[PDB]
Write a protein that binds this ligand. Structure first.
Ligand SMILES: [Mg+2]
Ligand SMILES: [Mg+2]
Lengths: 187, 187
């Protein structure tokens, strides 16, 4: 895994082999998945699977799984090759398809952590599905929050207006927008 | 709480009323405590209680508690006044004393999250106690990791050498060093 990550890092930041996240964003996800015991992870935006490998290693440490979604066949096949080079492929459900469809069909409260690194213009439309898929207590992590503040702004505003979420921005890599869903009232 | 935090923020960054963390560090702690369901928090370095209030609000949302430690009576009494101005004082065990003593005496695996913002030269000496107090799966968050990299370096090296920890650095505020303790082998 260490060797494979180092080889993938030789291509630098985003042609299909260029990385969708910084290495220190991957390190951040590694800590978050372990620290919140996030056994059920969803990723929207596999790219070549670099981010997925950090998530998959993390869920392997807590006997969990990653479901990832990628629009582009070219990136998906690179991702399949990368996963085939590790013992972690069995922990990854890699879907080649349309995230709006995949999100529309998933079940309620099924994910502990969702990592979003896809088409930012789509996020406001996906928000009802992202909110219902995230368990109460779960965490949403969104990449490119500072590199692409203007594109992210409508989505960040929707999430910040939702009293059921606590949010922040972490300037790791291209910026992470974090949002955690409150527990509901219980007896 | 919002009103009290805004008033405390009028004093800016570190004389006893000047803040020990940035507001966006407080927002980060708010998300972390909720997202990891960290009902048992330990803080080393209360200062005037600004950081403590973010932690206390967070644990209030998950019916938890914060134990905080401050060396300086002047800062401790400011912290008591600030806590007395909220419904959250009942969630805070504020100890005026020596962190090396308090840590030496606490029980094993009693804390979900530990926030360190104290005398950085001391951290390597405290490390055996910090490791044993943090539950497996728990998170250590250390402030001033980038503002004071040289002072932090021996401690960061000890923690990075420990195969039971997964680590990263988040450039929020003066820099957060995060370290999460692995689960042990289970049946
Ligand atoms: Mg990205
Ligand atoms: Mg500080």
């Amino acid at each position: 895994l260490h060797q494979l990550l180092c080889e993938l890092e030789e291509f630098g930041q985003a042609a299909q082999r260029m990385l969708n996240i910084t290495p220190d964003t991957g390190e951040f996800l590694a800590v978050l998945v372990r620290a919140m015991n996030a056994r059920r992870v969803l990723e929207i935006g596999t790219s070549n699977g670099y981010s997925t490998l950090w998530l998959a290693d993390a869920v392997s440490a807590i006997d969990g799984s990653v479901t990832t979604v990628e629009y582009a066949e070219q990136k998906y096949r690179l991702a399949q090759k990368n996963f085939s080079r590790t013992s972690l492929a069995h922990r990854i459900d890699a879907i080649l398809g349309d995230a709006g469809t995949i999100l529309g069909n998933a079940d309620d409260a099924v994910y502990d952590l969702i990592f979003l690194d896809s088409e930012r213009s789509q996020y406001p439309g996906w928000w009802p599905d992202l909110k219902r898929l995230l368990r109460p207590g779960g965490l949403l992590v969104v990449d490119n929050a500072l590199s692409h503040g203007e594109q992210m702004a409508p989505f960040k505003a929707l999430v910040e207006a939702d009293v059921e979420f606590t949010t922040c921005v972490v300037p790791v890599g291209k910026g992470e927008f974090l949002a955690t869903r409150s527990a509901l009232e219980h007896h």
